[PDB]
Structure prediction request, 806 residues.
Amino acid sequence: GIQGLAKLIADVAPSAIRENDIKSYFGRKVAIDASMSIYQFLITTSHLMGMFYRTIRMMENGIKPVYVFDGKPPQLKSGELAKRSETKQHNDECKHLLSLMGIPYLDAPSEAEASCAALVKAGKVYAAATEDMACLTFGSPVLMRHLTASEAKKLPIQEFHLSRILQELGLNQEQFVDLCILLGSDYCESIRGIGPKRAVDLIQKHKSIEEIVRRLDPNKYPVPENWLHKEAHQLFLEPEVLDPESVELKWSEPNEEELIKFMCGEKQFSEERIRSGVKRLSKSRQGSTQGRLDDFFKVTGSLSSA
Amino acid sequence: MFEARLVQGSILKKVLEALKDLINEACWDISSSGVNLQSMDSSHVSLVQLTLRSEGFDTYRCDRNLAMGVNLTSMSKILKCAGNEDIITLRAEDNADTLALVFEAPNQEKVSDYEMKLMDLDVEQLGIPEQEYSCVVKMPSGEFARICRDLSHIGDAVVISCAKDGVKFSASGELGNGNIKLSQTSEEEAVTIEMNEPVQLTFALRYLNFFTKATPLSSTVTLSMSADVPLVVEYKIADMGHLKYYLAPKI
Amino acid sequence: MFEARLVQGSILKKVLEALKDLINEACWDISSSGVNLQSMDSSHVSLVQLTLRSEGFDTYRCDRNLAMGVNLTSMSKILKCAGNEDIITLRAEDNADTLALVFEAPNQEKVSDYEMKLMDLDVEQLGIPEQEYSCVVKMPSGEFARICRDLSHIGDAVVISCAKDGVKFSASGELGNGNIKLSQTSEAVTIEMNEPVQLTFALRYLNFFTKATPLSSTVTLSMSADVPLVVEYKIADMGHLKYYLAPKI
Prediction:
């Protein structure tokens, strides 16, 4: 994702970040990045064990998950780097443990994270859950971090509100995009010049890198080699994502046998547990609850003390 | 230069006693219509609208549309230092960011003159919708508080069924199910369930305990509900104006 | 089908206020005679007996006989949802594991209803050893409550002594000693005696047995030597309430 972003925010607009408890998310439908998720568990039954437990915990608290997979990757920086020099096995093994638990899944046209955002900004889901701030760049209004952490690591989930970020940094999404790029995008090389906090300011009185470059120009702050500061700025805007409305996710009922006969058996693992597990998942069948006033009254604005 | 008086001044003690357990701050909008307060809750479920007209006051001088902010519980701790027969007076300068409270005595021998400093505010503000409320119930406030507290020892959230003959306050709990039925009674102790179409809704009983903190605040309590909308409980602050608590409904 | 109606329901609240700090779980016996409880406490000392007779019951129906098991705590909890002029309607079935309880106001406008579950149990029983008692005394209740509370402040036990003429309670503790005598009234007190007897009791469970004070106006103590003492209260025209404590040796 984007480099030093979380810190930048934390350090200049903490009002857009909250440290809530996993419980407060009861009734929320969230878009997850299966790829990264599946990875997190590894770093070989883990790609599914965590894909198991965690999703149970996410269910137990009322959170309704929708795992997402990536399709045909695009032009990522280090991505096509070895190309300057010239599997899905344990991946789909998950796209199974899911529907066998009654948990949705979607094949993103490319980068899931972008798709996740795609959803979130369509009311189809609450927030996007990844570890990479990218989602924010892609225009996602709400991003939840740590929702896939171990039951142990007592880390609370970290929420981020794009519309609050944009608020403080006084800059449109696009204007925010350039910031992420100059902050350290994983799509193109940043500019050795500007610093985390520095990069902000420039963007603040130069609503684009295109204007930031022509300004500072000495050989004291040179602009990258093959700088695609453009191509990127585009992706973060109009990515490749499956239409939101295209489908309706529906959490089904877990199939104890069919699944336990494809887990503790075919993949060998303590039966007693994966049984009480499927049991618990079956219990926590729901989440949505208590409405907000927003849900019925338009927000007037803000009264500020004299 | 804001300078206002209130002789039967126990109502201010009474409103801020029912304000401080809900919310930690308030956006005090002083207009020439009087003293107003729209403010959300802290849990993003509820809201307070306080309106105090000028004609419910005694003596009045408003020269500014003041928009200030009060930290509520320290102000309540200061309001705990005056009796209920005592006259409450407020003074405010539009450049001096402080509140000068003057507590007169009914025998005028004890004078109090307290001062609370100001803090800045950028509070959110949303507008309530105006609509048709399919059930408006006039009730005694003490009986209402008694009933919802009697339900508090069963479970946590309440289900309501509002219909023609009776109204049905039901709940579950760790000891099982229960429900109490009410009907109209054929000026303060009179009830009335005015109804067009029967409904069923879910609400939080703990927020009803929070809303019944204004039990001594009116003659009668009004309960206004419709389908999938914020319940508005109304305490008509007698001869003064009214306090309305909105509760966004549950799903 | 068992059904019962007691229009002095507040009494039963105080009846449950006799138990809800003293014993937590017990077994209830239901016959045509009325409601009966004969339970043991947790520290294996007090014999707790409660009788309500159905002659005082205003409306009764008991065809099949019941022996149920109740957590007395939560019954006292669900009994505290009615004012002090109300009516309790009890109803329990010969096949269902419940009590269906109807709080009925005299002004029948707010009526409360509850359905409490049951638990079949195996609490050991112990009956009343019927004997004589060499000394009986009948005294007012608030004065005895004051006496037991006060002697609990000096020491942890009480040595009582009765004779021809008066009665005496004594205790010795860390800051010295104290005693209080009473004299035979010639609101009042009575003694019928056969022998001047002295024994020793533990004031913790007198502070437990005290809480049945507003179910009566007076209180009876019946006792001898080398046998337990009986603290006795009267439920008005329906029954009575006994706490049996065996004295320290």
Notes: Residues 1-251 of chain B form a domain with the Proliferating Cell Nuclear Antigen fold (CATH 3.70.10.10). Chain B touches chain C through 14 residues (CB under 8 Å).
